[PDB]
C-alpha cells in the first residue's frame, strides 16, 4: 500500500494535479514505483486515502514482487470530456401556418 499523497493545499512539490479547464478536467499523476512485494500480485488500486476508491488498475496479468507504471497519455491518466451534447431536444407535430 504505497501512497500518492500529501503536499496538500496545492503546494508546488506535489505535481499531482486536477486541472479543471477548457470545458474539461485534467488529472495528472507521476509514474508509480513498486518493489519488494515478495509475492504474486494482480491489478493495482488507487485508493483515495480519505476512503473509497478513485479507480482500478487491472494490471492485465499477474506479476510478482515489483511494479512500474507510467500513463502513456503522458502521466495524466484522465482527461474528462463534456463536449457538445444538449439533452432536451424532442420532436413534435406542428402547424406549418402559411
Amino acid at each position: 500500500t504505497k501512497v500518492i499523497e500529501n503536499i496538500p493545499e496545492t503546494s508546488p512539490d506535489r505535481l499531482v494535479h486536477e486541472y479543471w479547464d477548457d470545458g474539461d478536467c485534467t488529472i495528472v499523476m507521476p509514474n508509480v514505483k513498486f518493489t519488494g512485494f515478495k509475492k504474486y500480485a494482480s491489478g493495482m488500486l488507487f485508493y483515495k486515502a480519505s476512503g473509497e476508491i478513485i479507480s482500478y488498475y487491472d494490471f492485465n496479468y499477474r506479476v510478482r514482487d515489483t511494479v512500474e507504471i507510467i500513463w502513456k497519455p503522458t502521466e495524466v491518466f484522465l482527461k474528462a470530456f463534456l463536449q457538445n451534447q444538449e439533452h432536451e431536444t424532442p420532436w413534435s407535430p406542428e402547424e406549418e401556418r402559411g
Binding site: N6, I7, P8, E9, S11, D13
Partner: protein
C-alpha cells in the same frame, strides 16, 4: 501605513496527518502577517521600512498603543477606522479622509508636538457624514486629539459624532464628594493639600434629607499662601427651601486645616445633604 490583514488561522487537521512543511509553510505566512498588525498597531509602521518590525529596532507593543505617523500621501486615501495616528501639520494643513465607518467605529489621532494651527489646520472626511460637522471638519488646535467615533453606520450613512481634547494639562478636580450635614450641623472637609492650588472654584449644594431645603451658592476662592488662608467670594445665591433671606438652609465657611484647604459647611438644619464639588482650580508654576 503598513496594511494589516484580519486574523488568519491555522488548520490543525493538517500537520501530523498531512505534509508537515507545506501546511506550515502556509502557517508562517499567517503568523508573520498576524503579528504584523499587532506590532504595526502598537508600534511605528515606519519600522517596517526597517527590518520589517524585526530585530531590536523592530516594532514593539505599547501598552499605551502607538499613534501611527505617516506621510499625507497615505492619508490621501480613506484611512481605516480603529487606527491611532500622530501627524503634525507644521508642514501644511492636511485632510485626513476616513472610510465610511460602522456604529462604534473609532478613529484616534493626535498632533504630539502640537504643530497644528490655522497655518497648520487639519481637514477630515469620514464618509457620508460627521455628526455636527457639515462637510469636512478642520482642526487648527495645537496639542489636540482627534477622536472620531461613528455613531451611525446603518446602510450608507456613517454618522460620526466628534470628540477632541487637549493632549495635556491639569484636568483633575481636587475635591468632589457628597455628605449629609451632621447632627452637629457642620463639618470640615479637606479640599486639597494647601499647596496644590492658588485658586480653586467649587460648588456646594446643601439639601435637606427630604430635599425640600436645598442650598446653593457660587463659590470662588483665593488661597492665601503666606497667611495660610483662603479668601472667598460668594454671590449669585440661590435657594429653594429657604425660610429666611439671610444665610439659610446651611452656611458655608472656609479654612485651611491639616495642610488642606478645609471648607466648614454649617447648617442649622439637621439632615442636610451637602455635595462638595470643586469644578475648577488654578495654581501658578514657573514663568514660561
Amino acid at each position: 501605513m503598513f496594511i494589516q490583514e484580519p486574523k488568519k488561522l491555522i488548520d490543525t487537521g493538517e500537520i501530523g496527518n498531512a505534509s508537515t512543511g507545506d501546511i506550515l509553510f502556509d502557517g508562517g505566512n499567517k503568523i508573520n502577517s498576524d503579528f504584523n498588525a499587532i506590532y504595526n498597531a502598537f508600534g511605528d509602521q515606519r519600522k517596517m521600512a526597517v527590518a520589517n518590525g524585526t530585530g531590536a529596532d523592530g516594532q514593539i507593543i505599547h501598552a499605551t498603543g502607538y499613534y501611527q505617523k505617516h506621510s499625507i500621501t497615505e492619508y490621501a486615501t480613506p484611512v481605516k477606522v480603529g487606527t491611532r495616528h500622530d501627524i503634525d501639520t507644521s508642514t501644511v494643513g492636511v485632510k485626513v479622509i476616513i472610510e465610511r465607518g460602522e456604529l462604534g467605529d473609532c478613529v484616534e489621532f493626535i498632533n504630539s508636538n502640537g504643530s497644528i494651527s490655522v497655518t497648520n489646520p487639519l481637514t477630515i472626511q469620514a464618509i457620508d457624514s460627521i455628526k455636527g460637522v457639515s462637510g469636512n471638519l478642520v482642526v487648527t488646535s495645537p496639542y489636540s486629539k482627534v477622536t472620531l467615533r461613528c455613531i451611525s453606520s446603518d446602510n450608507s450613512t456613517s454618522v460620526w459624532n466628534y470628540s477632541i481634547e487637549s493632549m495635556f494639562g491639569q484636568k483633575e478636580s481636587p475635591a468632589e464628594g457628597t455628605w449629609n450635614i451632621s447632627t452637629s450641623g457642620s463639618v470640615d472637609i479637606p479640599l486639597f493639600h494647601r499647596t496644590e492650588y492658588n485658586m480653586a472654584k467649587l460648588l456646594v449644594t446643601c439639601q435637606s434629607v427630604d430635599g425640600r431645603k436645598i442650598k446653593t451658592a457660587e463659590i470662588n476662592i483665593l488661597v492665601d499662601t503666606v497667611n495660610s488662608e483662603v479668601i472667598s467670594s460668594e454671590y449669585a445665591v440661590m435657594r429653594v427651601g429657604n425660610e429666611t433671606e439671610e444665610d439659610e438652609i446651611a452656611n458655608i465657611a472656609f479654612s485651611i486645616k491639616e495642610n488642606y484647604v478645609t471648607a466648614t459647611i454649617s447648617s442649622s438644619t439637621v439632615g442636610m445633604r451637602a455635595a462638595v464639588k470643586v469644578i475648577a482650580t488654578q495654581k501658578i508654576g514657573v514663568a514660561q
